[PDB]
């Protein structure tokens, strides 16, 4: 098969933390706002070994394309330049990203029906849950 | 690339209200934050208010809570600030930037938009020559007063006479402005040749010399 | 509020010269936060260093920015001519966002005294009905200085104005002219009018006068 639990349109349904998560990864106010305005379906999919995630909302449409493993530039939604490198490891995607010295990490997985997204920054976490649509 | 453009300089009575412009261009205008910052002559810098174009949603200072109302228009790709119930307080310099997302800094700035509001009224210069009553090198200058608009071109000598010049920065009076120049040249040159002061007011699209004529 | 407080409000330095700026903070923020711009002549900003030391583009490789906790910094490693200019930080962490008050950055040189001028009311103004007298104090430095008008051998202070050029492009100087607005009327009632300047040069103030009727 190869990646296939994660595949499928995901939509936001609760968030928690996000702020105070966006606050220690070091993002200004202004962006912090934005951000936390826009509330996107998760769209993900998967050819051969390039997974695809695609946040798509009316502020912004974002699209990471990662081989897994390798790693590969981003610009965040929240405006970072970023070194990523994504894993996949117990049935989870773990995603570290790297800027200015600094590492925050996106750990996908399945819970039962919905996916739960934890971003982690220096113990403070964020979980934000989507169910499919 | 890009580039905030603003009108230079408005002028508004008192008690009216005035909207001001930011036209944004060289990138995608509903992507980034745009700012405005009032700054006063002689003192530094003042947030007004942050504007999302693309939502029109705002951050603002409390400070400014009843005089700014920020909105944009994106067919036109414009931001504009509004300021109201205005007083001689709001005479500043009004600068609009893009915004810079994580970090949030301005990494572009228009040019100011210098508002003025004064009971107005295009009034030209009154050009008063001072001569003394000294040295090898003789101080002259002369007196350009009660002249509103702004700005006036004060030369010397159609600007023959330059280096050695200091043409002051004007104040507000009551509701008019007035500045002088100095200007220094030899006792050897002067009297027997002349010194004159040229100055010109665009807004009453006048032009004035004086003759530095001695007492000394 | 995160109040900024700018350390040397005032600063001058000679080309060459190792510079540091404080830029200090009354409560914690992000140092991807934490912004300096330059500013001359009153135009229009410009964004010099970001997110503490990053520093904008085009911005000369001898400007650094430096910063912790308690405090922040933007440092020089050789002064130039053209650094010479008002530097503001500012802060986007946390709502409001601030700005500190600025520190001006002036070109140091040698002391200067200032060449007194002192000028009576035209003939032309007091035929228009006026009565303005000037005194002009031009090409010195430091920019700190005192200017004291008296009539008869007393200050006035009522209706002076004074007005300040911005340091010379060429020398590093200032000047200064001091306007005394007055009725053609109380002109007429005294005498003798005299502008009085202390500048740190002389430590006997420079005294230039004149005499309504001479």
């Given at each position: 098969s190869m990646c296939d639990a994660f595949v499928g349109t995901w939509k936001l349904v609760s968030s928690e933390n996000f702020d105070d998560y966006m606050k220690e990864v070091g993002v200004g106010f202004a962006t912090r706002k934005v951000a936390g305005m826009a509330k996107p379906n998760m769209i993900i999919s998967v050819n051969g070994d390039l997974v695809t995630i695609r946040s798509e909302s009316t502020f912004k449409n974002t699209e990471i394309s990662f081989k897994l493993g390798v790693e590969f530039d981003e610009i965040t939604a929240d405006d970072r330049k970023v070194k990523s490198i994504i894993t996949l490891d117990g049935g989870a995607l773990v995603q570290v990203q790297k800027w200015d010295?600094k590492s925050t990490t996106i750990k996908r997985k399945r819970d039962g029906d919905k996916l739960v997204v934890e971003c982690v920054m220096k113990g403070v976490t964020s979980t934000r849950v989507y169910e499919r649509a | ?26 990138y995608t205008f509903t992507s980034n934050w745009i ?15 942050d504007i999302y174009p693309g939502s029109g949603s705002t951050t603002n ?9 920020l909105?944009v228009?994106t ?24 915004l810079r997302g994580y970090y949030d ?112 | ?29 992000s140092?991807s936060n ?58 986007w962490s946390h709502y409001?966002l ?117």
């Amino acid at each position: 098969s190869m990646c296939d639990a994660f595949v499928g349109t995901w939509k936001l349904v609760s968030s928690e933390n996000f702020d105070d998560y966006m606050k220690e990864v070091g993002v200004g106010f202004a962006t912090r706002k934005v951000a936390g305005m826009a509330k996107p379906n998760m769209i993900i999919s998967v050819n051969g070994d390039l997974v695809t995630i695609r946040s798509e909302s009316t502020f912004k449409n974002t699209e990471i394309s990662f081989k897994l493993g390798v790693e590969f530039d981003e610009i965040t939604a929240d405006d970072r330049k970023v070194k990523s490198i994504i894993t996949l490891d117990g049935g989870a995607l773990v995603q570290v990203q790297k800027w200015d010295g600094k590492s925050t990490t996106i750990k996908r997985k399945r819970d039962g029906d919905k996916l739960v997204v934890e971003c982690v920054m220096k113990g403070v976490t964020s979980t934000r849950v989507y169910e499919r649509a | 690339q890009v580039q905030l453009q603003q009108p230079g300089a408005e002028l508004v009575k008192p008690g009216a209200s005035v909207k001001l412009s930011c036209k944004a261009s060289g990138y995608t205008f509903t992507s980034n934050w745009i700012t405005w910052v009032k700054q006063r002559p002689g003192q530094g810098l003042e947030w007004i208010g942050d504007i999302y174009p693309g939502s029109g949603s705002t951050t603002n200072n409390e400070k400014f809570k009843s005089k700014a109302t920020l909105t944009v228009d994106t067919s036109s790709s414009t931001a504009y600030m509004q300021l109201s119930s205005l007083t001689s307080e709001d005479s500043a310099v009004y600068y609009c930037a893009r915004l810079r997302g994580y970090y949030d800094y301005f990494d572009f700035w228009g040019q100011g938009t210098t508002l003025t509001v004064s009971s107005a009224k295009t009034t030209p210069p009154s050009v008063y020559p001072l001569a003394p009553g000294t040295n090898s090198m003789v101080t002259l200058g002369c007196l350009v007063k009660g002249y509103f608009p702004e700005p006036v071109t004060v030369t010397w000598n159609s600007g023959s006479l330059s280096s050695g010049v200091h043409t002051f920065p004007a104040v507000l009076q009551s509701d008019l402005y007035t500045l002088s120049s100095s200007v220094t040249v030899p006792s050897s040159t002067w009297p027997s040749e002349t010194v004159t002061c040229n100055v010109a007011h665009p807004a009453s699209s006048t032009k004035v010399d004086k003759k530095i004529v001695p007492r000394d | 509020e995160v109040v900024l407080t700018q350390s040397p409000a005032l600063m001058a330095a000679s080309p060459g010269e190792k510079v540091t700026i404080t830029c200090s903070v009354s409560s914690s923020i992000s140092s991807s936060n934490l912004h300096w711009y330059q500013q001359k002549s009153e135009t229009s900003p410009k964004p010099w260093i970001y997110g503490t030391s990053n520093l904008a583009s085009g911005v000369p490789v001898r400007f650094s920015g430096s910063g912790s906790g308690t405090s922040y910094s933007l440092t020089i490693s050789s002064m130039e001519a053209e650094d010479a200019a008002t530097y503001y930080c500012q802060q986007w962490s946390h709502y409001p966002l601030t700005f500190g008050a600025g520190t001006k950055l002036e070109l140091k040189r040698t002391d200067a005294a200032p060449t007194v001028s002192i000028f009576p009311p035209s003939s032309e103004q007091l035929t228009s009905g006026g009565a303005s007298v000037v005194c002009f104090l031009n090409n010195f430095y430091p920019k700190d200085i005192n200017v004291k008008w008296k009539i008869d051998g007393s200050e006035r202070q009522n209706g002076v104005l004074n007005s300040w050029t911005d340091q010379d492009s060429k020398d590093s100087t200032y000047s200064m002219s001091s306007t005394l607005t007055l009725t053609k009327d109380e002109y007429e009632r005294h005498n003798s009018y005299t502008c009085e300047a202390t500048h740190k040069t002389s430590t006997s103030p420079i005294v230039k006068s004149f005499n309504r009727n001479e």
